Amino acid sequence: TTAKQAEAVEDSDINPWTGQRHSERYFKILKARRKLPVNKQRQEFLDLYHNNQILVFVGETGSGKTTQIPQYVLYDELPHQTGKLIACTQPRRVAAMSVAQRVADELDVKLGEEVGYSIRFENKTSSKTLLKYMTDGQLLREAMHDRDMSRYSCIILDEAHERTLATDILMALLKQLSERRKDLKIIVMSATLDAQKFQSYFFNAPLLAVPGRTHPVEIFYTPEAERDYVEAAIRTVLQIHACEPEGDILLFLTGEEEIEDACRRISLEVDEMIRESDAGPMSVYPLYGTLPPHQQQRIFEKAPQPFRPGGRPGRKCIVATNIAETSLTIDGIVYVVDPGFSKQKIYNPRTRVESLLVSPISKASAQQRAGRAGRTRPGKCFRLYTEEAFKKELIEQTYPEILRSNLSNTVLELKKLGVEDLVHFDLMDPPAPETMMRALEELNYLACLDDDGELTPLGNLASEFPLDPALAVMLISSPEFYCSNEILSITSLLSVPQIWVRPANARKRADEMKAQFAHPDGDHLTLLNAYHAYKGAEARGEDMKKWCHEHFLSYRHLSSADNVRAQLKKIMETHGIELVSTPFHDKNYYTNIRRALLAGFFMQVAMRESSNSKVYKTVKDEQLVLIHPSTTVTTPYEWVVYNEFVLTTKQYVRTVTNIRPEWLLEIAPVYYDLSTFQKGEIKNALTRVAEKIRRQQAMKASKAW
Ligand SMILES: Nc1ncnc2c1ncn2[C@@H]1O[C@H](COP(=O)(O)OP(=O)(O)O)[C@@H](O)[C@H]1O
Ligand SMILES: [Mg+2]
């Protein structure tokens, strides 16, 4: 129970968890581990853990705080083994999976056995699991079925400073739960030191702070901004690899596509650089949210060394998103390239505009990025933006995600959790009252709540799905349109990255191939066609990776979509939701699907303003939009249902499907209650089609007597 006793247990020959003998790797890694900053304060941790129910832990990135602390807890409760588990929550998937693998290696056990991870649609655990690294959202969803979280004896909320939505809701739930369950330990971990609010919130909880031990980082700035930050970044990476000593490079970018393309171009220009120059070898690794486990783990490979000793220093380049900002640490990094951008989620209430958007980072973010370089040795950060700009463009911190998000899912989850008074829920930072209200009416239109604010059977059923309320409701309602299977496929496809691949060498081909999958009526149906082609090839016995390459489709994203589809399907079967399909010979096959979309996306509809323009106008928001140029639809109809709302230089809607206005009035009578529309073109059009519907009811057949 004391620190040295725990160490002596760790030092033993046999593995206490598996009854097998420890490997040499285990002792190598152990001896390595005990050099970490958190180690020398282990005892001080244990004390604080032994005398307190709730504890606040604060340390810099690279301390050991995520990999070591759960293990400290594990070995501490080892002598009196409890039947419950240890949960560590990471706001980022990749962090959870990667760290799970690491701690698996440190405990000398198989991943998914004693140490396991839990992500939405990705479960690497079993009955053997004592330590689970999960996404905070995943734990939040577990709480909905288990309000007291009876399977956990200790819960470690990690990376709390990121102030994500699920983390905050979890903090509230756990504050309220610490009063009921005194047998539950709670450890809140952070990187930013200002956790006095965390203390005050959790009944003045104690604080353990690890002294920062980062080496000095020298910060470099450009003279004047460079418009295209990507090639700036690439030329920077090249200039470093050619004109600097030993070390590894951390290059921050925005998303998957940018990262892959940049990796490829860097690889090319480095390859040519080898044949012509003094520059040594350089391996390049991508790092982003959707990346599969193997490719995640490949970033921890060590750099290649020169062809001949004494010169040509070789190295690694990690082209990562802001995951590498604070969530995880890579050793060997000495240089950091910071273009100053990240993909941030923004939400405007009034305009109802929810969107992902590449935007300027925060001052705090910038400082973290710079900080990573000076861990092992003193390092330098190349910031592409100007110093003056740094000083006065950059917001000082990224505001709480709660403050900038759609709270429909949140309110649904809270209702499922039993919260009967939302506007008093003791969250750390209460959301804007009008925003949460908007969540309430959005839930009202989906018929997930009754007039008493309680869950509709449909709402309760919707909470059982790992989906946004709209998507969930669409899926659940689909049997009424006699196309549940197809809507399942489409839900799955909508829940994974885009499936299209467009390599630089084969663009014209790729595009054309994409066009071959195109359905005339909409993008959802195009996705459906591609997926069906994929399943046909799979059934036929084809090599699906080769088939996907050959057809310019992402095998990763498609297989992922199939995984998601499987899980959603068995959730559907559990709760008695019918799986039905219209015979393809029927003329209503596609119309049933297009209509089925309106069950969940009746609020994301736009109307073409005139024939003299390609401009569409959203319903009840009066937002001017264009159909995104990445459409398989060559003939957009007057009315469209869109899935996404992206903002670049112009406001786009993405993944649109042609619909008939009558369907809006039929499937969505309450929301398209015409008397609740403002004066304008949309109201007039819908009025005309309504009056048209009345003419249609020419029949006077019912009269009986
Ligand atoms: N997947 C991994 N493979 C090898 N080493 C790792 C891995 N993840 C983290 N580490 C090491 O563990 C140390 C502590 O980092 P970690 O505990 O993951 O996060 P935190 O910064 O919260 O402590 C780092 O110095 C890093 O070198
Ligand atoms: Mg960590």
Automatic annotation (TrEMBL):
It catalyses: ATP + H2O = ADP + phosphate + H(+). It comes from the Eukaryota. Transmembrane segments: none annotated. It is found in: Nucleus. Mg(2+) 2 binds at T66, E159. Pfam families: DEAD, HA2_C, Helicase_C, OB_NTP_bind, WHD_HA2. GO terms for cellular component: post-mRNA release spliceosomal complex. GO terms for biological process: spliceosomal complex disassembly. Belongs to the DEAD box helicase family. DEAH subfamily. DDX15/PRP43 sub-subfamily. Pre-mRNA processing factor involved in disassembly of spliceosomes after the release of mature mRNA. One of its GO terms (molecular function) is metal ion binding. Its EC number is 3.6.4.13. It comes from Chaetomium thermophilum (strain DSM 1495 / CBS 144.50 / IMI 039719). This is RNA helicase.
